[PDB]
Design a protein around this ligand. Sequence first.
Ligand code: HEM
Ligand code: HEM
Ligand code: H4B
Ligand code: H4B
Ligand code: K9C
Ligand code: K9C
Ligand code: CL
Ligand code: CL
Ligand code: GD
Ligand code: GD
Ligand code: ZN
Lengths: 400, 402
Amino acid sequence: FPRVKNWEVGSITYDTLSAQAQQDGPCTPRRCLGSLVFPPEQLLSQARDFINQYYSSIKRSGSQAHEQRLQEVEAEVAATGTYQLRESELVFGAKQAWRNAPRCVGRIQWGKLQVFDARDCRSAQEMFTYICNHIKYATNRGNLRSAITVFPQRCPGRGDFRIWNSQLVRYAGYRQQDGSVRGDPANVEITELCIQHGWTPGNGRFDVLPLLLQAPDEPPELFLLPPELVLEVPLEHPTLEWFAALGLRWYALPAVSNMLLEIGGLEFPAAPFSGWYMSTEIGTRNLCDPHRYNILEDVAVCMDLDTRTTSSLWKDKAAVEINVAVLHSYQLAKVTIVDHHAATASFMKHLENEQKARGGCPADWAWIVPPISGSLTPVFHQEMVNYFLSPAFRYQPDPW
Amino acid sequence: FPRVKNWEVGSITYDTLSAQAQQDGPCTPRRCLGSLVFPRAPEQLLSQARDFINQYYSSIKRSGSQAHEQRLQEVEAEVAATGTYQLRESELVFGAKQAWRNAPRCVGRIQWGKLQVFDARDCRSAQEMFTYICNHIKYATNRGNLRSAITVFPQRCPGRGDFRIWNSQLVRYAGYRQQDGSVRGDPANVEITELCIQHGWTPGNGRFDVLPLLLQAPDEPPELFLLPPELVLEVPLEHPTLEWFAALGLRWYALPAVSNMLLEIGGLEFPAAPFSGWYMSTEIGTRNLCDPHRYNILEDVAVCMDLDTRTTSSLWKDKAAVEINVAVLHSYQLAKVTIVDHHAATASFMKHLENEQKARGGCPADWAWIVPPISGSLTPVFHQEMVNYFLSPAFRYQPDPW
Ligand code: HEM
Ligand code: HEM
Ligand SMILES: C[C@H](O)[C@H](O)[C@H]1CNc2nc(N)[nH]c(=O)c2N1
Ligand SMILES: C[C@H](O)[C@H](O)[C@H]1CNc2nc(N)[nH]c(=O)c2N1
Ligand SMILES: CNCC#Cc1cc(C)cc(N)n1
Ligand SMILES: CNCC#Cc1cc(C)cc(N)n1
Ligand SMILES: [Cl-]
Ligand SMILES: [Cl-]
Ligand SMILES: [Gd]
Ligand SMILES: [Gd]
Ligand SMILES: [Zn+2]
């Protein structure tokens, strides 16, 4: 069992939970690949295993309904080639997928998740109304609440439910008279899929893209989001009066709409989940990545920093203030947000809870460590073990 | 072969060099352990030696020549007769350079060709060992214009014990346990400090007392050796605009010289081969001064900066650490002591990966060690996927000799 040390304190644990791993990862004894981003009847074995998880979690191994529920899935597959999850199981499976996500630093919250069941969804027009319920529920006038909406489980020989945008809220990416991009360059492609399918393109750096929702074996359909429902936060700095004039904004709800939820062998290619932001996601990655909004130099000129030499650490000063402006703005607007120090400190608490309950925790070091001030947070000093448990959120190819 | 993406540009390469990794690391297909600090007969000596010699004769563009099979047969016959063999001097120099080249946790490998190799394999005692080490420090420091060097002491051989430098670096500050429970000085060095005192060193009681060296000759107890103060170049720390910063009384030394690692070349083992370069400012500013278990000055600096420390979202920790780094850089520049900031170092590491892709089809790299401990995604290495693996020649960790 892997020895795991915390170098701040000196304490040692052993990950016994690693023993239960399922889908082999990308690493071999020859070379480590942990820094890479995107590295019939067998349906029964994963179903048995998930049901066993459910019942031991509610202290129900060696019991009647446990014995009993094993047969129904047995019978359901035999008769139909698949099965339906009991509503409580879909609830328990969604939380466990969240809990097992190695790249999520906010899993201290995993037990509080609202599960919208859209398994009887029927059309793209129906998807949109579920999506719109979710958003308004999750947003909650800025007091954000974790939530996932679960669309029907994919079935053999018949189409898929899929959301085409990577998130429920994404800003446009327009290409210009010189090839380059006005707006968010992360979404250049889906902006061009949208302009294609009827959308009248704007000219702004912060235009909420229209959704593309896909009924099975039908082409995607454009849906505009009602602007009253897309809560957004204008960015301003508590003491840098000019920062507001840069016209920067970000949206309130982080809602990932391109990952595939897998519970007990069943695959849900449409299952958007949402929480609230950690401030470095907006202030550091989305605003300061060279291939995202790349605002770093503009803020530095405004601060009258010396940008002629790297050793003035003007990049570091400008980045810290951009993060300050994000935190201050969301707090002033009363939108739930958490800083990287509070977030990582809560995750160290999660790791400890998980050690007592399950004997370990799959964590991906490069993703848990924040992208500014790494070693100032306690996770930097924490050794971690990465591996795959089910149920899980998985990546999936693009439906085109 | 593993596909490697740069997420800032879109570039894509394939690490073919990884195929040739002829030792195992800690990960399996079940689980990745890449974030752990310390994961870990003539036939095998021969095949390591054979492979290194092939490397050497490739580097001199004489692969498959008279000299080449000459040396191979020669090395086997020397193993057959003696159970080991000796490196020629130019083989030693190529072997130390490749070891630096192959080191996955080193961000400064752009410089890997520029290395001064001191051959101390004739060294015969701890006293001579000390004289060689003083000469290393003198040459490498070069009055502040630092030069990369390594001194190689006699290899491990059967029948005799190893030379060892008990100290983890040639320059280290003492760490004394206080009246209460606190450490005065550097808490990373409580153990080596206790060993020196137990071996008769007379301790000080400052926060920056340079430690003596504990030098072990084969089959010999370690011997204490004081470093002449004018040999250890130090830098008082001041901040260019925060004039109260100088009153903290903080110092760091110029020369980073790791002295406890094992150099392995062609199957042969050199347990004493100290190497030195020059510092990247985050090692001092962020890690050494701001780690909670090191000097731990962050809160004190932030209170002095009049930052609001009662709440994390004011980002006082981040603000105060950026200024401690500014101070480190400005102080070394003022003092005319070589130093590189994490923006310049990561930028030149990106050229190294480029040069190495062309030369060898890859480059072993430990992402979590290459990405600096502040401003990670502000540097380009954050956005570069990397493949960690073990190539020989190599610097390797070894157990403490006590
Ligand atoms: C409630 C507050 C939450 C916070 C502060 C949080 C924080 C984060 C952060 C910072 C990331 C890194 C994403 C990136 O860098 O692109 C992440 C990833 C992730 N989160 Fe969370 N999260 C929260 C809730 C949730 C919920 C409710 C779910 C699912 C039900 C979830 C599932 C995931 C998954 C699957 C990833 C991996 C994303 C990927 O691989 O691209 N998180 N989280
Ligand atoms: C000349 C400028 C150099 C720079 C800027 C540099 C930079 C660095 C840095 C920042 C680290 C991480 C240290 C830590 O976090 O503890 C490192 C590690 C390392 N470097 Fe370099 N280095 C230089 C020269 C050298 C030389 C001359 C050698 C050997 C010939 C070398 C071999 C290594 C090794 C073996 C490690 C890993 C040590 C460990 O894992 O504890 N470096 N380097
Ligand atoms: C190449 C590297 O693995 C990649 O840029 C990763 C590093 N760590 C990350 N961590 C998080 N949370 N999100 C990311 O997008 C990344 N990017
Ligand atoms: C646990 C974790 O791996 C550990 O704190 C590592 C992280 N990355 C590092 N990177 C460097 N360069 N130096 C270090 O000491 C560490 N420490
Ligand atoms: C490309 N990753 C975007 C993202 C994200 C994300 C998702 C959730 C649920 C919370 C959070 N804080 N962030
Ligand atoms: C715990 N490793 C300490 C270290 C180090 C180091 C070593 C060298 C040669 C250069 C450098 N810049 N840093
Ligand atoms: Cl985002
Ligand atoms: Cl150091
Ligand atoms: Gd001005
Ligand atoms: Gd001043
Ligand atoms: Zn790995």
